[PDB]
Design an enzyme around this catalytic site. Sequence first.
Site, PDB file in Angstrom:
ATOM      1  N   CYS A  45       0.782  -1.235   0.000  1.00 28.66           N
ATOM      2  CA  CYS A  45       0.000   0.000   0.000  1.00 28.66           C
ATOM      3  C   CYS A  45       0.812   1.282   0.000  1.00 28.66           C
ATOM      4  O   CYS A  45       0.324   2.322  -0.487  1.00 28.66           O
ATOM      5  CB  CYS A  45      -1.021   0.027   1.142  1.00 28.66           C
ATOM      6  SG  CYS A  45      -0.374   0.290   2.838  1.00 28.66           S
ATOM      7  N   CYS A  73      -1.878   3.665   0.749  1.00 31.31           N
ATOM      8  CA  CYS A  73      -1.678   4.263   2.078  1.00 31.31           C
ATOM      9  C   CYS A  73      -0.434   5.152   2.067  1.00 31.31           C
ATOM     10  O   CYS A  73       0.316   5.174   1.084  1.00 31.31           O
ATOM     11  CB  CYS A  73      -1.529   3.177   3.144  1.00 31.31           C
ATOM     12  SG  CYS A  73       0.031   2.300   3.016  1.00 31.31           S
TER      13      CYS A  73
END
Length: 235
Positions: A75, A157
Amino acid sequence: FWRQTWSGPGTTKRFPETVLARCVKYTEIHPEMRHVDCQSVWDAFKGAFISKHPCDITEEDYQPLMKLGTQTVPCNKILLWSRIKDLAHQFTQVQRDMFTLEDTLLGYLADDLTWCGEFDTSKINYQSCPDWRKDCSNNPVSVFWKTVSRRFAEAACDVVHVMLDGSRSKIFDKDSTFGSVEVHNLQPEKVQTLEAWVIHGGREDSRDLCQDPTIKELESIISKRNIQFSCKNIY
Ligand SMILES: [Ca+2]
Ligand SMILES: [Ca+2]
Ligand SMILES: [Ca+2]
Protein backbone atom coordinates in the site's frame (compact mmCIF):
# COMPACT_ATOMS: atom_id res chain seq x y z
CA PHE A 1 -27.86 9.06 -41.21
CA TRP A 2 -27.01 5.52 -40.13
CA ARG A 3 -23.86 4.71 -38.14
CA GLN A 4 -21.38 2.55 -40.12
CA THR A 5 -18.41 2.11 -37.80
CA TRP A 6 -16.59 3.01 -34.63
CA SER A 7 -13.68 5.43 -34.95
CA GLY A 8 -11.07 3.58 -32.91
CA PRO A 9 -8.73 0.62 -33.41
CA GLY A 10 -10.42 -2.78 -33.26
CA THR A 11 -9.59 -5.46 -30.72
CA THR A 12 -5.90 -6.32 -30.73
CA LYS A 13 -5.30 -9.32 -33.01
CA ARG A 14 -4.98 -12.56 -30.98
CA PHE A 15 -6.46 -10.84 -27.88
CA PRO A 16 -7.91 -14.02 -26.32
CA GLU A 17 -4.66 -15.98 -26.73
CA THR A 18 -2.64 -13.04 -25.42
CA VAL A 19 -4.73 -12.55 -22.26
CA LEU A 20 -4.69 -16.27 -21.48
CA ALA A 21 -0.93 -16.53 -21.98
CA ARG A 22 -0.35 -13.45 -19.80
CA CYS A 23 -2.49 -14.94 -17.06
CA VAL A 24 -0.55 -18.22 -17.20
CA LYS A 25 2.81 -16.41 -17.06
CA TYR A 26 1.91 -13.98 -14.30
CA THR A 27 0.37 -16.69 -12.13
CA GLU A 28 3.34 -19.06 -12.59
CA ILE A 29 5.71 -16.31 -11.40
CA HIS A 30 3.72 -14.71 -8.59
CA PRO A 31 3.88 -16.89 -5.45
CA GLU A 32 0.47 -15.71 -4.17
CA MET A 33 -1.60 -16.23 -7.31
CA ARG A 34 -1.13 -19.99 -7.89
CA HIS A 35 -4.81 -20.52 -7.00
CA VAL A 36 -5.93 -18.66 -10.14
CA ASP A 37 -7.69 -20.57 -12.90
CA CYS A 38 -6.67 -18.69 -16.04
CA GLN A 39 -9.54 -20.18 -18.09
CA SER A 40 -12.03 -18.84 -15.51
CA VAL A 41 -10.27 -15.45 -15.64
CA TRP A 42 -10.63 -15.34 -19.42
CA ASP A 43 -14.28 -16.40 -19.28
CA ALA A 44 -15.04 -13.60 -16.77
CA PHE A 45 -13.13 -11.03 -18.81
CA LYS A 46 -14.78 -11.94 -22.11
CA GLY A 47 -18.21 -12.09 -20.41
CA ALA A 48 -17.87 -8.49 -19.27
CA PHE A 49 -17.94 -7.03 -22.76
CA ILE A 50 -19.30 -9.51 -25.29
CA SER A 51 -22.88 -9.38 -26.60
CA LYS A 52 -23.37 -5.68 -25.83
CA HIS A 53 -22.81 -2.29 -27.45
CA PRO A 54 -19.29 -1.38 -26.32
CA CYS A 55 -20.31 1.95 -24.84
CA ASP A 56 -22.89 0.17 -22.69
CA ILE A 57 -20.20 -1.55 -20.58
CA THR A 58 -20.30 -0.61 -16.89
CA GLU A 59 -17.98 -1.28 -13.94
CA GLU A 60 -20.49 -3.82 -12.69
CA ASP A 61 -19.78 -5.94 -15.81
CA TYR A 62 -16.18 -6.38 -14.63
CA GLN A 63 -17.10 -7.48 -11.11
CA PRO A 64 -16.73 -11.24 -11.77
CA LEU A 65 -13.24 -10.62 -13.16
CA MET A 66 -12.37 -8.34 -10.20
CA LYS A 67 -13.33 -11.12 -7.78
CA LEU A 68 -11.08 -13.67 -9.52
CA GLY A 69 -8.26 -11.13 -9.67
CA THR A 70 -8.29 -10.17 -5.96
CA GLN A 71 -4.72 -9.53 -4.84
CA THR A 72 -2.87 -7.69 -2.10
CA VAL A 73 -0.66 -4.76 -3.02
CA PRO A 74 2.10 -2.97 -1.09
CA CYS A 75 0.00 0.00 0.00
CA ASN A 76 2.81 2.39 0.82
CA LYS A 77 4.61 2.34 -2.56
CA ILE A 78 1.81 2.97 -5.03
CA LEU A 79 2.18 5.00 -8.21
CA LEU A 80 -1.37 5.57 -9.46
CA TRP A 81 -2.59 4.90 -13.01
CA SER A 82 -2.61 8.05 -15.14
CA ARG A 83 -2.12 9.45 -18.65
CA ILE A 84 1.64 8.98 -18.15
CA LYS A 85 2.33 5.45 -19.31
CA ASP A 86 5.83 4.34 -20.52
CA LEU A 87 7.32 5.15 -17.12
CA ALA A 88 7.62 8.90 -17.44
CA HIS A 89 10.85 8.21 -19.30
CA GLN A 90 13.83 6.31 -17.95
CA PHE A 91 13.09 6.88 -14.25
CA THR A 92 14.97 3.71 -13.40
CA GLN A 93 15.09 4.03 -9.60
CA VAL A 94 11.46 5.15 -9.40
CA GLN A 95 10.44 2.05 -11.36
CA ARG A 96 12.39 -0.11 -8.88
CA ASP A 97 10.72 1.53 -5.88
CA MET A 98 7.11 1.96 -7.05
CA PHE A 99 4.31 -0.49 -7.54
CA THR A 100 2.19 0.35 -10.57
CA LEU A 101 -1.15 -0.99 -11.68
CA GLU A 102 0.38 -3.17 -14.44
CA ASP A 103 2.26 -4.96 -11.64
CA THR A 104 -1.02 -6.57 -10.55
CA LEU A 105 -2.45 -9.59 -12.35
CA LEU A 106 -5.39 -7.72 -13.80
CA GLY A 107 -3.34 -4.70 -14.95
CA TYR A 108 -0.72 -7.04 -16.45
CA LEU A 109 -3.45 -8.86 -18.39
CA ALA A 110 -4.85 -5.77 -20.08
CA ASP A 111 -1.81 -3.52 -20.45
CA ASP A 112 -1.26 -2.23 -24.02
CA LEU A 113 -4.37 -3.97 -25.38
CA THR A 114 -7.63 -2.82 -26.94
CA TRP A 115 -10.89 -4.80 -26.99
CA CYS A 116 -14.64 -4.61 -27.52
CA GLY A 117 -17.58 -6.71 -28.65
CA GLU A 118 -20.86 -5.97 -30.34
CA PHE A 119 -24.56 -5.94 -29.63
CA ASP A 120 -25.67 -8.64 -32.08
CA THR A 121 -23.23 -11.56 -31.45
CA SER A 122 -20.99 -13.08 -28.82
CA LYS A 123 -17.99 -12.39 -31.06
CA ILE A 124 -15.04 -10.12 -30.37
CA ASN A 125 -15.00 -7.06 -32.66
CA TYR A 126 -11.66 -6.93 -34.53
CA GLN A 127 -12.91 -4.27 -36.95
CA SER A 128 -13.27 -1.14 -34.82
CA CYS A 129 -13.94 -0.12 -31.22
CA PRO A 130 -15.12 3.19 -29.78
CA ASP A 131 -12.51 5.94 -29.74
CA TRP A 132 -12.33 7.71 -26.37
CA ARG A 133 -12.32 11.15 -27.97
CA LYS A 134 -14.70 10.64 -30.87
CA ASP A 135 -17.28 7.98 -29.87
CA CYS A 136 -17.46 7.37 -26.11
CA SER A 137 -15.03 7.89 -23.26
CA ASN A 138 -16.63 5.08 -21.21
CA ASN A 139 -15.84 2.03 -23.34
CA PRO A 140 -14.73 -1.54 -22.54
CA VAL A 141 -11.09 -0.46 -22.19
CA SER A 142 -11.50 2.75 -20.17
CA VAL A 143 -14.20 1.23 -17.95
CA PHE A 144 -11.90 -1.73 -17.24
CA TRP A 145 -9.20 0.72 -16.06
CA LYS A 146 -11.74 2.67 -13.98
CA THR A 147 -12.82 -0.56 -12.25
CA VAL A 148 -9.33 -1.84 -11.50
CA SER A 149 -7.86 1.54 -10.62
CA ARG A 150 -10.75 2.22 -8.20
CA ARG A 151 -9.69 -0.76 -6.10
CA PHE A 152 -6.02 0.22 -6.49
CA ALA A 153 -6.67 3.72 -5.10
CA GLU A 154 -8.73 2.27 -2.24
CA ALA A 155 -5.72 0.12 -1.30
CA ALA A 156 -3.18 2.93 -1.19
CA CYS A 157 -1.68 4.26 2.08
CA ASP A 158 0.98 6.67 3.40
CA VAL A 159 2.48 8.70 0.51
CA VAL A 160 0.80 7.95 -2.79
CA HIS A 161 2.21 9.22 -6.08
CA VAL A 162 0.83 10.12 -9.49
CA MET A 163 2.60 11.37 -12.63
CA LEU A 164 0.64 14.03 -14.56
CA ASP A 165 1.28 15.05 -18.15
CA GLY A 166 2.34 18.71 -18.03
CA SER A 167 1.74 19.03 -21.77
CA ARG A 168 -1.98 18.22 -21.64
CA SER A 169 -4.54 20.99 -22.08
CA LYS A 170 -5.89 19.99 -18.64
CA ILE A 171 -2.87 18.75 -16.66
CA PHE A 172 -5.31 17.54 -14.04
CA ASP A 173 -8.45 16.48 -15.90
CA LYS A 174 -11.66 15.50 -14.09
CA ASP A 175 -12.48 13.28 -17.10
CA SER A 176 -9.33 11.13 -16.86
CA THR A 177 -9.26 7.82 -14.95
CA PHE A 178 -7.20 9.57 -12.27
CA GLY A 179 -9.45 12.62 -12.01
CA SER A 180 -12.80 10.80 -12.22
CA VAL A 181 -12.08 7.69 -10.16
CA GLU A 182 -8.73 7.40 -8.38
CA VAL A 183 -8.48 10.77 -6.67
CA HIS A 184 -11.93 10.29 -5.09
CA ASN A 185 -11.08 6.87 -3.70
CA LEU A 186 -7.95 7.66 -1.76
CA GLN A 187 -8.91 6.88 1.87
CA PRO A 188 -8.03 9.52 4.48
CA GLU A 189 -7.79 6.83 7.15
CA LYS A 190 -4.86 5.34 5.25
CA VAL A 191 -3.35 7.96 2.97
CA GLN A 192 -1.17 10.70 4.42
CA THR A 193 -0.25 12.59 1.23
CA LEU A 194 -0.92 12.56 -2.50
CA GLU A 195 2.21 13.74 -4.30
CA ALA A 196 1.79 14.74 -7.97
CA TRP A 197 4.84 14.80 -10.19
CA VAL A 198 4.04 17.03 -13.17
CA ILE A 199 6.16 15.92 -16.14
CA HIS A 200 7.33 18.71 -18.44
CA GLY A 201 7.44 18.22 -22.22
CA GLY A 202 10.37 20.58 -22.80
CA ARG A 203 11.19 24.22 -23.50
CA GLU A 204 13.96 23.88 -20.92
CA ASP A 205 12.51 24.69 -17.52
CA SER A 206 9.34 26.60 -18.40
CA ARG A 207 6.58 27.80 -16.06
CA ASP A 208 5.83 26.40 -12.62
CA LEU A 209 3.07 23.99 -13.58
CA CYS A 210 2.21 23.34 -9.92
CA GLN A 211 0.48 26.73 -10.07
CA ASP A 212 -1.71 25.70 -13.03
CA PRO A 213 -5.44 26.29 -12.39
CA THR A 214 -6.14 22.55 -12.79
CA ILE A 215 -3.53 21.73 -10.15
CA LYS A 216 -5.28 24.16 -7.84
CA GLU A 217 -8.46 22.23 -8.56
CA LEU A 218 -6.70 18.97 -7.64
CA GLU A 219 -5.28 20.54 -4.48
CA SER A 220 -8.83 21.56 -3.48
CA ILE A 221 -10.25 18.06 -4.00
CA ILE A 222 -7.46 16.47 -1.98
CA SER A 223 -7.66 19.09 0.81
CA LYS A 224 -11.38 18.43 1.17
CA ARG A 225 -10.59 14.71 1.68
CA ASN A 226 -8.26 15.70 4.62
CA ILE A 227 -5.22 14.39 2.78
CA GLN A 228 -2.04 16.41 2.28
CA PHE A 229 -1.08 17.54 -1.23
CA SER A 230 2.40 17.92 -2.68
CA CYS A 231 3.25 18.98 -6.23
CA LYS A 232 6.66 18.86 -7.92
CA ASN A 233 7.75 19.90 -11.42
CA ILE A 234 9.76 17.24 -13.08
CA TYR A 235 11.71 18.84 -15.92
CA1 LIG B 1 -22.14 4.21 -21.39
CA1 LIG C 1 -3.85 11.85 -15.78
CA1 LIG D 1 5.62 -1.48 -12.78
